[PDB]
Amino acid sequence: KIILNGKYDIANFNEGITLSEAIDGVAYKMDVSLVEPKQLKDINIKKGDKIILIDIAYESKKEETIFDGVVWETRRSEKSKKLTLSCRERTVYMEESEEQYQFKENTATQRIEYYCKQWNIPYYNLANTGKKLAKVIHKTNILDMIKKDLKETATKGGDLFRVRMDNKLKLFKLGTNANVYKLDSILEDANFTSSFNDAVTSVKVLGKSKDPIIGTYKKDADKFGTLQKIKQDEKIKNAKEAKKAAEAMFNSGEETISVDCAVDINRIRAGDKVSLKSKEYYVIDVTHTLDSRPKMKLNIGSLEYIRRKFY
Amino acid sequence: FNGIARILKENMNKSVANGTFGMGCELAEITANGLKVNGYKDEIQDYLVLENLTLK
Amino acid sequence: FNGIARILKENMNKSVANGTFGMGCELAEITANGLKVNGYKDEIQDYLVLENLTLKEDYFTFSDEALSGEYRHKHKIETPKELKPLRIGDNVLVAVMGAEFVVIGRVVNAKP
Amino acid sequence: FNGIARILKENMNKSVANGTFGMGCELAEITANGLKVNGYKDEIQDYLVLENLTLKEDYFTFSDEALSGEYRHKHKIETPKELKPLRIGDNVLVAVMGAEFVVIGRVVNAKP
Amino acid sequence: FTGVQGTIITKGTIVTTIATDEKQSIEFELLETKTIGENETVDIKAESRIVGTIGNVSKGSISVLLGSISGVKSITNKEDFRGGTDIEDEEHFR
Amino acid sequence: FTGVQGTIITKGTIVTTIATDEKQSIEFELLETKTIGENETVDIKAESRIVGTIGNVSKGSISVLLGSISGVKSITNKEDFRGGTDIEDEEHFR
Ligand SMILES: [Fe+2]
Numbered sequence: 001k002i003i004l005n006g007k008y009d010i011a012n013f014n015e016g017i018t019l020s021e022a023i024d025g026v027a028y029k030m031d032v033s034l035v036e037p038k039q040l041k042d043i044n045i046k047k048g049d050k051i052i053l054i055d056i057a058y059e060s061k062k063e064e065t066i067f068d069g070v071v072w073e074t075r076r077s078e079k080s081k082k083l084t085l086s087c088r089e090r091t092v093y094m095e096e097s098e099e100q101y102q103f104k105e106n107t108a109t110q111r112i113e114y115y116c117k118q119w120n121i122p123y124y125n126l127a128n129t130g131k132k133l134a135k136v137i138h139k140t141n142i143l144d145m146i147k148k149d150l151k152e153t154a155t156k157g158g159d160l161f162r163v164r165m166d167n168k169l170k171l172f173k174l175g176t177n178a179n180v181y182k183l184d185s186i187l188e189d190a191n192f193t194s195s196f197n198d199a200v201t202s203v204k205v206l207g208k209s210k211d212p213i214i215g216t217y218k219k220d221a222d223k224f225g226t227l228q229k230i231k232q233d234e235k236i237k238n239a240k241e242a243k244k245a246a247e248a249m250f251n252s253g254e255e256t257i258s259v260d261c262a263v264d265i266n267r268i269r270a271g272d273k274v275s276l277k278s279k280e281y282y283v284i285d286v287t288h289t290l291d292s293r294p295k296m297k298l299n300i301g302s303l304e305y306i307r308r309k310f311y
Numbered sequence: 312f313n314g315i316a317r318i319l320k321e322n323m324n325k326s327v328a329n330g331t332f333g334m335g336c337e338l339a340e341i342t343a344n345g346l347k348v349n350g351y352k353d354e355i356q357d358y359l360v361l362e363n364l365t366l367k
Numbered sequence: 368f369n370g371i372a373r374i375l376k377e378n379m380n381k382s383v384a385n386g387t388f389g390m391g392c393e394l395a396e397i398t399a400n401g402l403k404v405n406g407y408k409d410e411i412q413d414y415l416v417l418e419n420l421t422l423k424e425d426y427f428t429f430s431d432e433a434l435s436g437e438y439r440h441k442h443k444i445e446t447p448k449e450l451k452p453l454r455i456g457d458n459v460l461v462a463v464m465g466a467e468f469v470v471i472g473r474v475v476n477a478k479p
Numbered sequence: 480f481n482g483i484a485r486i487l488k489e490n491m492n493k494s495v496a497n498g499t500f501g502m503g504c505e506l507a508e509i510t511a512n513g514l515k516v517n518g519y520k521d522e523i524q525d526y527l528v529l530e531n532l533t534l535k536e537d538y539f540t541f542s543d544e545a546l547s548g549e550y551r552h553k554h555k556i557e558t559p560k561e562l563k564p565l566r567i568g569d570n571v572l573v574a575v576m577g578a579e580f581v582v583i584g585r586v587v588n589a590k591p
Numbered sequence: 592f593t594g595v596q597g598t599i600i601t602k603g604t605i606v607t608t609i610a611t612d613e614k615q616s617i618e619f620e621l622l623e624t625k626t627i628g629e630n631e632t633v634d635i636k637a638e639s640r641i642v643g644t645i646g647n648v649s650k651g652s653i654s655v656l657l658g659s660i661s662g663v664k665s666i667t668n669k670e671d672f673r674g675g676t677d678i679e680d681e682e683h684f685r
Numbered sequence: 686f687t688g689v690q691g692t693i694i695t696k697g698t699i700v701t702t703i704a705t706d707e708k709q710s711i712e713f714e715l716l717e718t719k720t721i722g723e724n725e726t727v728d729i730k731a732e733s734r735i736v737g738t739i740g741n742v743s744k745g746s747i748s749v750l751l752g753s754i755s756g757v758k759s760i761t762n763k764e765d766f767r768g769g770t771d772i773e774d775e776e777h778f779r
Pocket of ligand 1: 440441552553
């Protein structure tokens with residue numbers, strides 16, 4: 001409804017906005033399509049411009065900044081003067097800037113604070129993930145390093161954390177959204193899919209590092225059969241770490257719902273805890289599309305499958 | 312289309328892990344059963360050694 | 368559709384490079400700070416070495432006693448230059464296993 | 480759509496094989512032409528070796544002097560058969576680092 | 592227990608048997624807090640976390656110290672664990 | 686600090702105590718920028734990042750560096766950290 005840019009208000013030009021995020025996505029993504037007459041052409045929107053989308057929030061019905069990022073790419077058509085943007089929050093910067101860091105044994109929160117301090121990234125008070133990580137040397141992107149240590153934190157019994165940018169970097173635990181919205185009331189169509197596609201019933205740990213930690217921790221072998229994996233990570237250097245990694249991998253296969261909603265719940269985001277029918281599910285992916293009729297589509301799943309796949 | 316990307320990324324990790332298996336230096340310990348290499352379920356009963364390790 | 372192929376090929380190179388990292392033998396040099404491996408930003412302050420590299424710089428074994436009384440045949444075995452222990456400035460080969468480095472030994476050029 | 484999957488899988492194998500090439504330890508044999516690494520068409524005429532493999536074939540250290548005058552206790556230390564320097568026909572283990580080969584040492588079968 | 596002298600093994604620490612595909616690990620929990628003594632060893636009583644005769648493992652089966660307490664080298668169970676009664680039999684109850 | 690002379694330790698660096706399975710490491714932030722001296726050591730002031738009595742750790746406990754700095758060999762605290770008042774209790778305030 002309001003698109004601030006730097007100074008102007010280009011909400012008087014946009015054909016539609018689509019706010020999309022994935023649980024493992026690089027960044028909260030806003031793809032706003034505009035018509036580009038002389039008026040919009042004058043201001044000369046370039047890549048790197050700062051877009052802030054403001055719309056009436058679902059919670060309190062007050063205008064709140066639902067998106068605050070930067071224009072990552074502009075594509076302009078000439079025959080039809082339709083300028084199209086693809087906005088990203090500043091976690092896209094972290095996913096592109098490579099750097100090598102050597103880390104001793106420590107927790108994920110300390111590592112994230114170290115990254116932010118090194119690269120001068122503003123950040124709120126980061127939640128203590130608690131889990132203690134093994135010494136590693138990293139080379140991938142900063143977001144890649146953060147995701148790697150968060151995955152290793154999900155292993156060893158730690159809670160599932162996800163990093164979202166907003167104005168200043170936030171360490172967002174998955175099941176900690178304020179409002180557990182119920183989608184059954186506006187359920188245009190749902191697609192309950194169940195499978196054994198990524199089911200894990202057994203896991204045979206073969207430790208590449210010593211405390212000779214080896215074991216098997218089959219959990220539902222009698223019911224679904226011995227759907228076995230082999231976890232052979234150097235980071236597992238402990239018997240309890242092996243047991244917790246095994247326990248953080250068992251699941252009954254893929255179990256998700258491809259939900260389609262006729263009303264756009266504005267504040268939904270990846271990782272949020274949302275209800276369909278009596279059950280509760282975590283948002284694997286959300287794709288708003290703020291056309292003339294607000295609309296939302298969701299892909300949600302159980303905790304076990306999400307932990308198995310994305311962690 | 313995110314499902315295709317996730318499946319393909321899983322295939323990336325699968326293929327890379329399979330290619331890296333059975334390659335590079337690894338730690339091990341000697342046992343009565345034979346060599347016991349870290350990250351291997353079974354002991355290797357037939358293995359080679361450097362000739363400087365065969366000293367009396 | 369060439370853009371998808373190019374992006375996917377970039378992903379191929381990315382994944383292969385990430386998988387190959389922290390694996391295979393690598394060259395290195397010893398410093399006062401610690402081990403300095405080629406292709407690494409930081410020096411490794413904790414590393415392992417082969418036990419044959421830990422020999423004493425001088426007199427690494429008394430090696431026998433052959434007589435006593437009338438004469439006293441007994442000796443000490445000086446370390447040769449090649450088998451001396453590691454010192455600062457030694458070019459060495461290092462085996463990389465994640466975050467655990469093993470120094471195989473020094474390296475020199477090969478005669479014909 | 481199975482054709483796309485098969486082509487892509489062929490690309491997986493291609494990229495992984497290319498990335499794994501020139502990496503990791505490999506067996507080799509010494510020749511008059513130079514080093515001959517298993518799995519390589521051509522012999523490597525320039526290579527590095529560990530310094531412990533450069534020991535003299537005979538009398539690699541004088542190792543002490545213990546007396547002089549009345550008697551003259553002094554000796555030389557013959558190289559054992561195991562620690563002799565490289566010669567043509569020696570099966571060796573080689574560390575491959577791109578276009579830089581390092582010969583770790585000879586290889587023999589392991590006793591029980 | 593076996594390990595560095597002065598190390599404290601606390602109550603609530605968990606030890607397990609080696610897991611195999613045929614039998615899962617049988618967990619045990621320490622009932623006492625003690626320090627490794629002058630012999631670089633210490634004996635501590637423990638109970639099986641799960642009831643039943645499966646907890647009555649044989650000597651030497653409990654070798655895995657589940658946790659991570661630094662300074663502890665190795666463990667072993669000299670005696671076969673005892674007790675571990677199952678449900679009372681139908682005929683005996685009759 | 687302890688390390689090679691000429692190594693530069695900067696303000697804002699975090700040094701922590703030894704974490705365990707039980708305790709989270711207590712974080713301390715350096716307040717100064719200094720170089721290691723001719724004694725291959727240097728004294729740098731610091732504070733506990735978390736305000737409270739937990740920051741008043743004992744001597745010799747702050748021994749872990751967060752972000753590896755080349756040239757630093759080891760670190761330690763000669764004296765127990767002081768201050769670290771917690772919030773006043775409701776009874777004393779009443
Ligand atoms: Fe003599």
